[PDB]
Amino acid sequence: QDCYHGDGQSYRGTSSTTTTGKKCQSWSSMTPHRHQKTPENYPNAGLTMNYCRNPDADKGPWCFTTDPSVRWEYCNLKKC
């Protein structure tokens, strides 16, 4: 099962697609979106490849988007 539990900071699945069906930008890529959500900045977060994560304590997993126009979105993951 690829779901999450409550806030999903726990998650470590390899779901890398947006809520709207967009590819997730890779965490360390500063293209298209430059940001500070790097493993250098969050060594415990699991800010690997381009999978949905929660380095910020948000309500659920998300990622930056490869759509230059859409900086970030929630992930297409379910609460389990």
Binding site for ligand ACA (CB under 6 A): 35-37, 56, 58, 62, 72
Q: Is 34 annotated as a binding residue?
A: no
Complex with ligand ACA: residue 1 or 55, whichever CB lies closer: 55
> What is the enclosing helix (H) or strand (E) of 31?
none
Check whether the bond before 32 is cis (ω within 30° of 0). Answer: yes
58 is in an annotated binding site: yes
9 with 64: CB under 8 angstroms? no
Alpha carbon 54 to its chain centroid, in Å, reads 6
Question: Which is nearer to ligand ACA, 13 or 45 (by Cβ)?
Answer: 45
Specify binding-site residues. 58, 71
Which residues fall in the annotated binding site for L-lysine? 58, 71
